[PDB]
Amino acid sequence: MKASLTFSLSGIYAPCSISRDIYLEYGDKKAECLYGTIRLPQYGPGCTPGKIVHCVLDDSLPFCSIVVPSKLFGFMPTQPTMDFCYFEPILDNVVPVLDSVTFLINEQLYSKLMDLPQEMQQIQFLHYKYNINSMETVVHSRDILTSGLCQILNCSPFPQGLVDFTETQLILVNDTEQKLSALKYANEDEEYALPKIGTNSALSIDLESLPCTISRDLLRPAPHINDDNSIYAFTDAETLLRLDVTSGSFITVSNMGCVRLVKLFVLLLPNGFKKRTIYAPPKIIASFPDCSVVTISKSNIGHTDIPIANQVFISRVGGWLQSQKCFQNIILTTLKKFFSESKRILCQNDLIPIAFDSSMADLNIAEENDESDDEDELGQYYKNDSLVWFFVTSAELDCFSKDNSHFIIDPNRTKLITTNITNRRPLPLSRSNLQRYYGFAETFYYDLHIFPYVRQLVNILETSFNCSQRGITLNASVLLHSTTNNVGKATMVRFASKYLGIHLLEIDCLSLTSNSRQLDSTSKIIGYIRAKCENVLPYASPAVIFLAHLDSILLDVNANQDPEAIKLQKSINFEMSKLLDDFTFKFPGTTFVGSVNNIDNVPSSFRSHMRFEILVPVPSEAQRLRIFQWYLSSHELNRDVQQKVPVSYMDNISFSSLSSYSAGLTPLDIKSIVETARMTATARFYQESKKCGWLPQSILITQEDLSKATSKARNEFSVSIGAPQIPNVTWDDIGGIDFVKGEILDTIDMPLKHPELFTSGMKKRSGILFYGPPGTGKTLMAKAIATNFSLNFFSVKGPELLNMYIGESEANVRRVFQKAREAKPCVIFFDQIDSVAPKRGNQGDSGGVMDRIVSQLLAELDGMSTDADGVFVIGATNRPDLLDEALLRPGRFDKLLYLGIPDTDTKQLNILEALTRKFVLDNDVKLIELAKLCPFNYTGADFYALCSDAMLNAMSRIARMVEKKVSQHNELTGENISTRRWFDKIATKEDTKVVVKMEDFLKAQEQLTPSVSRAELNHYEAVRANFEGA
Amino acid sequence: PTKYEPIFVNCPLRLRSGILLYGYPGCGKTLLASAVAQQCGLNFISVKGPEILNKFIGASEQNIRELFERAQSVKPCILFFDEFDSIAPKRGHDSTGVTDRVV
């Protein structure tokens, strides 16, 4: 409930009291102590996690007033405090107890601590100075015990709970690089640190924008009047307290270009912001793109100046959403609200921001509106998602005045007149993040040091938009293409716009166009595009015409198609290029960003025109690190999950692990991952019972569920694109398996930094080829190596899919190795079956498609590209002589490696027993003879039938038993009883008694399937292969 | 495995999915198939002879897709292939891939 809050100075921890009205309602005999939770209406879009509190009764506190130790957030008491807060008691004494806590201590205090003789004395020392009482003090994560000298690093498992000196595990650390020096309370210094200065000069201060909309409730002054939030600005109690009063009616902010006005309020205690600065909403920042602040000043302006104006002009300000036809009805309607719902103060030549949203259009509010004023309710349902500017261009003062400025408008008399379109460059992002203020679906923000392509594109546009137009500018034309889709080039272009304030005209071909009628005319597309550009390009400059999925309109000349279609193709291609040139030459500042799903398909007639096309590779782990931190950011999760309590991770996740473990080939839509994580977390939360023995305060994501989600995502992506998994049990990381392992390790290491520092510049990188009899280790080795030392195992798995009738096989293999280069630490396993055809290079299957395939494969197999490339090639063949050394030549697949021989000690009866253990085994099967009845050189692969056929034999015996049973009963009860009916009715839990014994196994072995390859084949290939490998 | 399904339902660990017959001509194995087709009561799909192939480009792939789709969508059945060589020769081919893509 609503509660007034105050701050005391009673030790670092103390059960601070509350008013008796609240206390007596819950501090009854059912508990010896009162516990609850406190809630501060802090700034920001959502809200922070709440904090536990311990209370005792007190009669000195007035109606519904609460006290807390001012330090608990770490600021001075003199600072303006809460007007109100939320409090709620913990019912049924359900107070959690923490399992472990971590502490960070300084050198002197830590030494003094451990120098104590015994554990009990150390616990008492912890107890005394910190006033922490066991089973009665609730502590939280990241709590600073004392300013700049010690801190509690974290708590587990819960964010907040009680501490037991003999059950809660206390961990202490000191380290050496002195984090603690910077870990001081927020009140780093006293209020009087800043020297006093009188009413001398302007003393203006820098200008910065708010992070979010400011709620009306937290205001310390009385918002008595219906001022429409129009000019409020905030400061951190400095540069204003020096003045006579902090509640000035009006403040001028500047008159560098032309004058503007603001109102100032002191920022309240727990804020987080840059020190000693002014904060204003976007409407104020609009007038000051250059961050001039020249003369902020206060004067006795009074309550009113120029209370009336007539025929106030308003005008359009260009841009895509302003000009589009669909929205005009609602958007003009909404203007009448903005200008009529409440009082506001305008300036000459000023900008008003107004929100227009979510296609909430053709949804007429009502047939009539004369009878009531009820617009405010709708806002509870209209969450905004887009903004347009309107420009007043003027002031229409009719009387005499000092200057035609700083004038009030009156809803009763101040009628409005619209006029034709005007241009004005929007704000750049680094000047003010417009989106966050209005809670829009915020576009991504890159750091320009880590992403190459955005830096390139943005600089190329930046040099053009204004840097060069002062002279004469080369018309800009840039095309974005990527080997893979969803890679965020629309986000690139939108970010470019937001960073440079350049208007963006996003013409997405799919939705905007109406093509594929394949009528006898292309004039529709031409007129549509040209008209829409024409409507907006004048008075919107600089502009970015962005054609998305351009390849739907412009595409290659498939001259094998029927005539009278290709003629439309020519028509459209040429005419489009005509519009290209027309825009570039007729208008100043056209740039035409394009995006294409695959570059080749753009016809040559059009490809040449553009310059410096950008390849947009999929993000590497260094980028992934920043995009996980973006999606998992503080209030991206919270944005629309309107549930009772916000969401966060707050601890324990390791972005390097997430980035490395399997985020390779998750090129974008990590949103899927993070949303699945949110899902698991929220489900685990809501399923909690009301009593449950415990209650979770907020949703917390854990790294285990995130790993689960990434595995799930990779599995569900597997259907879309083939992706190996780890379905292996009890057969992994056998470092000592064989002598071969050392060579594997000593050849896999050199091209990698962490095993071998050398860059392998001149040194030849090579793959690994295994050779020998099939069925004895060629696959498990690969998975083992990949998952233990390498990271990715995106094997070919499809070489047999050689080619279509089109000669695309070369492109196919190129794409295979491009997928290889994606998720750079990847090892490609070659099945080595049919795409490795050439025995002699000139005699097999005419040397056709496959000969080109093999030529390309050997050409690209290792071009000494780069160590950082990470592409390793592993394969498994019966014979290296199976090939003509085209791709087996030294330098590629070199360091040929032998599979080895198991016959010395086959170490597989154990594996047989372990596998069969899942099946009934305790029937004398365990003994050795079952394996020893066959020569010790027995094939390993045969066991996986030996077991199966044995089981089948068992099932046969039991089956003949029941075949007896049924007959018997048919003789006893009736011959007409169906077998299925009988076996259903007389069914028993003992049906699973699938009798199995040694004799079953021996019968199965001697009956059928001697082996896959046992007689002589294996032996002589083994010996010959070992001999020729020297 | 249909007659004694509670015996066969449990223990999915190991199994064999199909069987291959071959022998001298006239040794009843077609008649074995026929009898197994009719007395067993299990559904039986008779793709006798290399009817799988089709004139148009890569129609064989789609044909096999349809065949297996019908097999799955019909309740448990036997896909009967005879003169298997006619539909699955060795890997090597000088001709188009329309005769080996099928394999």
Ligand SMILES: Nc1ncnc2c1ncn2[C@@H]1O[C@H](COP(=O)(O)OP(=O)(O)OP(=O)(O)O)[C@@H](O)[C@H]1O
């Ligand atoms: N760097 C990024 N950070 C966060 N989200 C991103 C990023 N890149 C892409 N996205 C996500 O993907 C979207 C951008 O790609 P989108 O699918 O809209 O178009 P596109 O990249 O042109 O793709 P396609 O060509 O396949 O249609 C964003 O709206 C966001 O949801």
Ligand SMILES: Nc1ncnc2c1ncn2[C@@H]1O[C@H](COP(=O)(O)OP(=O)(O)OP(=O)(O)O)[C@@H](O)[C@H]1O
């Ligand atoms: N159990 C049996 N043993 C021997 N002959 C049988 C048996 N059952 C039926 N026959 C008769 O002998 C023939 C067995 O050979 P059949 O014609 O079925 O061979 P097939 O499997 O079609 O041979 P292929 O494809 O090599 O020509 C049957 O067509 C039938 O006339």
Ligand SMILES: Nc1ncnc2c1ncn2[C@@H]1O[C@H](COP(=O)(O)OP(=O)(O)O)[C@@H](O)[C@H]1O
């Ligand atoms: N020395 C070994 N190294 C790795 N796996 C082995 C070994 N011996 C037996 N195995 C097991 O049996 C299989 C050995 O042959 P495998 O690598 O599968 O070749 P193939 O694919 O020709 O059957 C492995 O999959 C593994 O499960």
Ligand SMILES: [Mg+2]
């Ligand atoms: Mg796109």
Ligand SMILES: [Mg+2]
């Ligand atoms: Mg026959």
